[PDB]
Amino acid sequence: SLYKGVYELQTLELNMETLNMTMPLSCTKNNSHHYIMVGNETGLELTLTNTSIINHKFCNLSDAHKKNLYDHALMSIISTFHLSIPNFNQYEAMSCDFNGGKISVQYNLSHCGTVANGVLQTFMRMAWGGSYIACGNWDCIMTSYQYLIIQNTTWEDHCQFSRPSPIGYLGLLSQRTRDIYISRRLL
Amino acid sequence: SLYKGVYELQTLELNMETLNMTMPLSCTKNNSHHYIMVGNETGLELTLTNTSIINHKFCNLSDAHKKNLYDHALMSIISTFHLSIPNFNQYEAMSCDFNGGKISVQYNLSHCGTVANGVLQTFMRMAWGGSYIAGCGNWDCIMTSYQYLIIQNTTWEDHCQFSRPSPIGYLGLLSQRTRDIYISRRLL
Amino acid sequence: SLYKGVYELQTLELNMETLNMTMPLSCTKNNSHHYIMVGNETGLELTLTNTSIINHKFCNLSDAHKKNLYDHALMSIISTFHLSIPNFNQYEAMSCDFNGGKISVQYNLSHCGTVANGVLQTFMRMAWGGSYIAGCGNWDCIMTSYQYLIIQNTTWEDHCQFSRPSPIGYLGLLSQRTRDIYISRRLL
Amino acid sequence: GTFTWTLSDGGYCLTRWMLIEAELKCFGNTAVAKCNEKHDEEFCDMLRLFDFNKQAIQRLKAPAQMSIQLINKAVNALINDQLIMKNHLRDIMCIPYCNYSKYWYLNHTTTGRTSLPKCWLVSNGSYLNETHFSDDIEQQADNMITE
Amino acid sequence: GTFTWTLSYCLTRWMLIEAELKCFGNTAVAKCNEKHDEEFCDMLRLFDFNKQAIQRLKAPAQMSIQLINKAVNALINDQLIMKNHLRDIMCIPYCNYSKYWYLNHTTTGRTSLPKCWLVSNGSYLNETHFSDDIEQQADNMITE
Amino acid sequence: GTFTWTLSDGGYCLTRWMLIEAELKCFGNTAVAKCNEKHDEEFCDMLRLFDFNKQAIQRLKAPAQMSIQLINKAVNALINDQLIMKNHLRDIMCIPYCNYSKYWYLNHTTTGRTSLPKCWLVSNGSYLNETHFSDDIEQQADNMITE
Ligand SMILES: *[C@@H]1O[C@H](CO)[C@@H](O[C@@H]2O[C@H](CO)[C@@H](O[C@@H]3O[C@H](CO[C@H]4O[C@H](CO)[C@@H](O)[C@H](O)[C@@H]4O)[C@@H](O)[C@H](O[C@H]4O[C@H](CO)[C@@H](O)[C@H](O)[C@@H]4O[C@H]4O[C@H](CO)[C@@H](O)[C@H](O)[C@@H]4O)[C@@H]3O)[C@H](O)[C@H]2NC(C)=O)[C@H](O)[C@H]1NC(C)=O
Ligand SMILES: *[C@@H]1O[C@H](CO)[C@@H](O[C@@H]2O[C@H](CO)[C@@H](O[C@@H]3O[C@H](CO[C@H]4O[C@H](CO)[C@@H](O)[C@H](O)[C@@H]4O)[C@@H](O)[C@H](O[C@H]4O[C@H](CO)[C@@H](O)[C@H](O)[C@@H]4O)[C@@H]3O)[C@H](O)[C@H]2NC(C)=O)[C@H](O)[C@H]1NC(C)=O
Ligand SMILES: *[C@@H]1O[C@H](CO[C@@H]2O[C@@H](C)[C@@H](O)[C@@H](O)[C@@H]2O)[C@@H](O[C@@H]2O[C@H](CO)[C@@H](O)[C@H](O)[C@H]2NC(C)=O)[C@H](O)[C@H]1NC(C)=O
Ligand SMILES: *[C@@H]1O[C@H](CO[C@@H]2O[C@@H](C)[C@@H](O)[C@@H](O)[C@@H]2O)[C@@H](O[C@@H]2O[C@H](CO)[C@@H](O)[C@H](O)[C@H]2NC(C)=O)[C@H](O)[C@H]1NC(C)=O
Ligand SMILES: *[C@@H]1O[C@H](CO[C@@H]2O[C@@H](C)[C@@H](O)[C@@H](O)[C@@H]2O)[C@@H](O[C@@H]2O[C@H](CO)[C@@H](O)[C@H](O)[C@H]2NC(C)=O)[C@H](O)[C@H]1NC(C)=O
Ligand SMILES: *[C@@H]1O[C@H](CO)[C@@H](O[C@@H]2O[C@H](CO)[C@@H](O)[C@H](O)[C@H]2NC(C)=O)[C@H](O)[C@H]1NC(C)=O
Ligand SMILES: *[C@@H]1O[C@H](CO)[C@@H](O[C@@H]2O[C@H](CO)[C@@H](O)[C@H](O)[C@H]2NC(C)=O)[C@H](O)[C@H]1NC(C)=O
Ligand SMILES: *[C@@H]1O[C@H](CO)[C@@H](O[C@@H]2O[C@H](CO)[C@@H](O)[C@H](O)[C@H]2NC(C)=O)[C@H](O)[C@H]1NC(C)=O
Ligand SMILES: *[C@@H]1O[C@H](CO)[C@@H](O[C@@H]2O[C@H](CO)[C@@H](O)[C@H](O)[C@H]2NC(C)=O)[C@H](O)[C@H]1NC(C)=O
Ligand SMILES: *[C@@H]1O[C@H](CO)[C@@H](O[C@@H]2O[C@H](CO)[C@@H](O)[C@H](O)[C@H]2NC(C)=O)[C@H](O)[C@H]1NC(C)=O
Ligand SMILES: *[C@@H]1O[C@H](CO)[C@@H](O[C@@H]2O[C@H](CO)[C@@H](O)[C@H](O)[C@H]2NC(C)=O)[C@H](O)[C@H]1NC(C)=O
Ligand SMILES: *[C@@H]1O[C@H](CO)[C@@H](O[C@@H]2O[C@H](CO)[C@@H](O)[C@H](O)[C@H]2NC(C)=O)[C@H](O)[C@H]1NC(C)=O
Ligand SMILES: *[C@@H]1O[C@H](CO)[C@@H](O[C@@H]2O[C@H](CO)[C@@H](O)[C@H](O)[C@H]2NC(C)=O)[C@H](O)[C@H]1NC(C)=O
Ligand SMILES: *[C@@H]1O[C@H](CO)[C@@H](O[C@@H]2O[C@H](CO)[C@@H](O)[C@H](O)[C@H]2NC(C)=O)[C@H](O)[C@H]1NC(C)=O
Ligand SMILES: *[C@@H]1O[C@H](CO)[C@@H](O)[C@H](O)[C@H]1NC(C)=O
Ligand SMILES: *[C@@H]1O[C@H](CO)[C@@H](O)[C@H](O)[C@H]1NC(C)=O
């Protein structure tokens, strides 16, 4: 295609996979499995599932901080995810498990304008490319899946659907602690 | 007014009320009554006065969150107000109930360099349009005769008699959140 | 030096010490002692050292706030320092004494990605000019031989014997307050 | 960081609803093009806010109950918060400041070309007369003559 | 605040998909020091930062993301990502930061600044959707 | 958000108090006007800081005890903190960086007109030689002849 006679239209596509060494990269396998590659060796897995893996209502972050067995980058990423949730006020909707340096978090997404809506909005912001599978309305978005599970994992050939991209995490970095409610007077 | 020979001077005046459906609009009725409409149905009422409404040093924030029953936009606005207070260190000044899903917050403003002046600073920055009636040289050393600041929900009527509605106070203060807060614990 | 004949190269050095009344000024006396002017009457003394002063694992910031016997500017600077620490998770590391209204905060700095590394990362930025003395390609895994970092309050004297005063470094750290904190509870 | 929102439909026109007792007013592409570059323009920030309001009511489905999360995200993209900070800073020192209410522009009698509206300043709780900042109007006219 | 990172331009094979040494002139990359709503300049800053990070800084034993958490604001305008998200939710074209388009003279090497190929409804927009933008770009090229 | 603070006065002059033994240093409209648009200039940020200090001390009554709430609000309006972040990034990376102390400008001997000062970059515990950044000086001279 030529414009004004002499000019010719040409394109490029940026390879957002060489940035793994310094930038978390969102990613998607299928509608019920998305991924965040923190490094070549390790990453986080975000699934939307009917079935749960944490059957209790304890997160218990303080003991995990005291033990200090978890991976710091993964903890930072899930902290960015949680603090990015707008108007999180139901603590019982979240449970966790950090035994032996593990990272596992569960958001109970069990109608318009609730905690599940905020968790889902942060989910589609984190995995921006591929989460649209799981428009017109945004103020309350709902999926048939009941639970959102965040876990640690080893990195593999996970990006089957959408290309990797750092844009979701870099966009959520600026949004931390913007819509959090007050829970204590002295804060 | 003609400038040079062809340039006419004309003026606009934007109508902020059309922005109601998508933003809060800070307003002002008089010096002792200010309003924040969130849509056309509801809003907050920020009054400086001398009479108590809350007579207990409690604020059930956690139980209020657990029970929900409140308007989420109003909760977020009062959260933005509280987090924007510079250098807050006296929890007993603040009181609230939140029973039945309502919203009712009281700041106990009863000297230079205190917690009351920060509350007045954020109060003026919220109702920027008409809080000036409530000196420039005495900044960060401000004081008012009024003892209490009551932030309580209300249904919406035409309250803007002194100054027009405007979103600029809330939008400008959204960047103030968690900026001057002290640390109360070793892990935040 | 004349560049391309007509032009002459000239230099100016800003006297940033005259910004004392409006904003604090970081400065360095030696690799072991750094200072923060807050006006010409007081400031903070940061010291990497081997001898502790605290000798307990208590940081009663909440009792310190309730009593309200401290300087608010110094407490805000301490809050900016503590919040700016990237990935602080060992509450036992920090222990502070605010008895009688003073300020005294000790970080126990006793391998990549440790709490001592984050504390030193913030320390090198709070006193940005002249803290390098305390292999420039190693950033994430900085570890100094000193065992503790002690932040006290002190009446100001001419402590600048190695580096000039500079407001830059506190202004930089103001923009990194709540950008690396881990979550410690389900509701913040 | 900085604003990025771009107006949609190459000048821009404020309708009757967007103005207090005034008909529809259109500003040409030349004046609106200044809003892409300049950062200290209150009027451009208000244009971005009004355009975003128009798009939000037009496109997004209305919720069951109002939510202000959208502006809580988009405030930094639609406006320069530090411009509001400068306005507040001039407010607290009794320097003249803009409360984003009234604006003024030069308008050519024949061609109809207009400069970018500059905000009218208020001091003592009242609009400054046309005489106090007449130097600003004359220098803006000099700029508009140079074009 | 506004971005500041100096773009210390040539895109290598590793930075690109199915391409080899796309090099833009000084005039094209000079626009990244002033333009604020250009996705390509932000990604250029990101790639240059990644390059200098792997080259200069010693790799840690375990990866950490403190540095990117600190430099994200300097390297890129987060509000551009915010605007792209806003366009994404409102069912209108947006940029996912992958594909860009520019114009080169067939007789000279002088290129324009690449602009993003907007995606809409899960697919790239046709060239006829924004042909007006291409023509306006070429108009500014002949004018400039 | 983008900085917005406007220097008060045309041109701008730094008195001897603001400088380490350099008397009055005055810059014309050409250099000062660049600070409205240029974002990656340390000297313009320092000019805004010094002007804000002057305005604050002369206008606002000093408090009984010093409070730094004012600068905590105005830090993002007076300076580009991302410039400080960049300088820190170059400091840790061992790339040359600016510690905001020393600046250099090209002074026209006959007309007396000067360019906008650029910061003298620092490394190795000292200031660089003029030979290292002579390319920058040559480019500045090339720009300053070409208008
Ligand atoms: C996370 O991100 C990093 C980048 O930050 C990325 O590392 C890069 O991986 C790519 C491959 O995906 C590497 O690309 C190869 O590069 C070499 C040249 O090496 C350069 O980089 C190394 C490492 O820094 C330097 O030491 C060296 O001096 C160079 O700078 C090329 O030779 C390779 O070319 C091969 O592929 C081409 C395309 O198909 C072929 O045309 C070419 O002929 C080569 O293929 C043939 O030769 C190969 C070598 O013998 C052979 O193995 C093949 O089978 C075939 O015969 C190629 O471009 C890049 O260098 C890496 N850079 C760094 C800094 O590590 C990680 O891969 C990424 N990780 C994840 C999870 O994806
Ligand atoms: C930014 O946005 C652009 C545009 O959306 C993305 O580019 C597309 O990326 C998607 C996902 O990677 C590509 O979809 C894949 O297409 C493959 C076939 O491509 C060819 O054939 C199709 C028609 O069949 C043509 O339309 C296309 O142009 C090619 O000629 C499929 O084989 C892939 O299958 C995968 O997804 C399907 C479901 O859709 C699964 O059932 C499969 O099992 C498998 O997981 C897939 O459909 C799309 O082709 C790309 N378009 C172009 C032209 O580039 C960028 O990836 C995106 N970038 C980022 C980082 O967000
Ligand atoms: C998170 O902690 C709870 C609470 O544990 C107790 O209180 C802590 C502060 C600490 O002092 C612990 O040592 C205490 O045990 C854990 O729930 C406990 O589970 C054990 C084992 O079943 C049981 O004996 C205790 O009674 C429980 N405590 C309470 C208060 O009910 C919980 O298991 C921890 N989370 C995880 C994921 O292990
Ligand atoms: C919540 O605060 C209440 C007091 O709050 C007020 O009274 C309540 C009955 C309700 O109307 C609130 O909206 C009001 O703001 C605390 O109630 C008492 O707490 C004490 C301990 O301080 C306890 O011994 C008493 O049994 C409680 N009840 C009464 C009637 O005094 C309550 O503890 C706070 N916490 C929770 C979780 O509710
Ligand atoms: C820091 O506080 C601890 C805990 O005491 C409580 O919190 C204080 C801030 C204050 O509110 C007290 O009234 C509370 O009891 C102090 O530890 C106590 O010390 C006293 C005196 O030795 C002892 O009798 C108590 O049993 C201790 N309580 C506990 C829970 O250990 C501590 O003294 C304070 N820090 C320092 C350095 O003195
Ligand atoms: C996720 O939330 C749902 C809804 O609250 C929980 O399901 C409830 O479980 C309780 C306790 O057994 C029952 O009384 C309710 O009737 C259930 N409600 C529904 C709608 O199923 C569910 O248990 C929660 N899951 C976890 C792991 O906490
Ligand atoms: C998530 O993290 C945990 C803890 O690191 C992983 O389980 C550990 O695997 C390492 C391998 O060296 C062992 O040394 C630890 O003792 C294990 N701890 C536990 C929790 O058993 C776990 O494998 C990681 N997640 C996945 C799916 O790989
Ligand atoms: C809230 O503002 C909306 C617009 O955002 C107002 O709705 C407009 O009202 C005017 C009244 O003159 C009508 O001409 C317009 O057609 C209306 N527009 C839309 C999109 O509805 C509404 O009136 C305002 N409500 C209140 C209570 O002030
Ligand atoms: C708000 O705080 C003031 C003090 O700042 C309270 O007034 C005090 O009330 C106690 C009650 O025992 C008296 O002993 C004090 O003398 C009062 N102080 C003053 C200065 O009058 C006031 O009661 C508080 N209000 C509420 C509603 O709790
Ligand atoms: C900005 O300031 C001007 C000047 O004070 C305000 O104009 C006043 O508005 C009120 C409310 O309608 C009127 O009662 C006054 O008569 C107006 N005075 C003048 C001089 O016209 C204006 O309302 C303010 N705007 C905002 C949004 O705060
Ligand atoms: C703190 O800064 C003030 C204000 O810049 C300094 O006071 C100036 O002192 C110089 C000489 O040092 C005088 O020429 C100025 O007239 C003074 N200005 C004012 C407004 O008083 C003061 O010296 C500084 N103090 C310290 C201890 O550094
Ligand atoms: C700072 O922390 C270190 C450990 O990180 C403390 O040193 C330990 O002290 C205990 C006291 O029971 C000894 O049993 C350990 O052997 C010590 N470990 C090492 C490596 O020296 C140190 O005492 C702490 N300092 C303070 C002031 O609390
Ligand atoms: C910026 O860096 C320069 C060069 O390292 C510093 O210059 C030194 O300043 C101290 C101040 O007491 C003098 O004693 C040294 O002799 C100076 N060194 C040289 C080589 O001239 C300067 O202080 C730094 N400025 C800031 C604000 O940190
Ligand atoms: C650049 O050089 C010129 C050369 O004249 C400087 O002019 C000075 O002007 C002042 C009055 O404004 C006189 O008192 C000085 O004697 C002049 N200096 C010389 C060397 O002749 C001018 O100030 C310089 N500009 C800057 C910004 O430093
Ligand atoms: C992961 O990266 C390391 C270098 O950081 C490399 O030695 C190792 O082979 C890589 N493993 C992969 C590509 O899975
Ligand atoms: C506040 O809202 C509650 C319901 O949450 C309602 O009962 C109450 O009347 C409202 N307050 C006012 C003053 O209208």
Ligand SMILES: *[C@@H]1O[C@H](CO)[C@@H](O)[C@H](O)[C@H]1NC(C)=O
């Ligand atoms: C740094 O200066 C202080 C001034 O009191 C001195 O005590 C300390 O010993 C000095 N540093 C060293 C390690 O010599």
Ligand SMILES: *[C@@H]1O[C@H](CO)[C@@H](O)[C@H](O)[C@H]1NC(C)=O
């Ligand atoms: C710190 O402040 C306290 C009062 O809060 C004072 O008594 C003490 O002397 C100060 N510290 C120093 C070193 O002067």
Ligand SMILES: *[C@@H]1O[C@H](CO)[C@@H](O)[C@H](O)[C@H]1NC(C)=O
């Ligand atoms: C500008 O002036 C012309 C001529 O008076 C008029 O037709 C036009 O409507 C005016 N436009 C504005 C923006 O007021």
Ligand SMILES: *[C@@H]1O[C@H](CO)[C@@H](O)[C@H](O)[C@H]1NC(C)=O
């Ligand atoms: C208006 O503000 C100025 C500056 O503070 C003040 O001097 C003046 O007295 C005020 N208005 C009047 C006339 O009271």
Ligand SMILES: *[C@@H]1O[C@H](CO)[C@@H](O)[C@H](O)[C@H]1NC(C)=O
């Ligand atoms: C200037 O403002 C005053 C009110 O402060 C007004 O009376 C006067 O008429 C204005 N200027 C002129 C000369 O019209």
Ligand SMILES: *[C@@H]1O[C@H](CO)[C@@H](O)[C@H](O)[C@H]1NC(C)=O
């Ligand atoms: C310049 O145009 C030529 C000829 O079509 C093309 O090969 C080249 O890719 C263009 N320049 C760039 C930087 O892509």
Ligand SMILES: *[C@@H]1O[C@H](CO)[C@@H](O)[C@H](O)[C@H]1NC(C)=O
């Ligand atoms: C070209 O764009 C048109 C307009 O939307 C579209 O209908 C058509 O399918 C596009 N052509 C393709 C995909 O080849």
Ligand SMILES: *[C@@H]1O[C@H](CO)[C@@H](O)[C@H](O)[C@H]1NC(C)=O
């Ligand atoms: C930079 O300067 C330091 C301090 O003088 C010196 O030790 C170091 O060798 C220098 N490095 C290089 C590469 O010149």
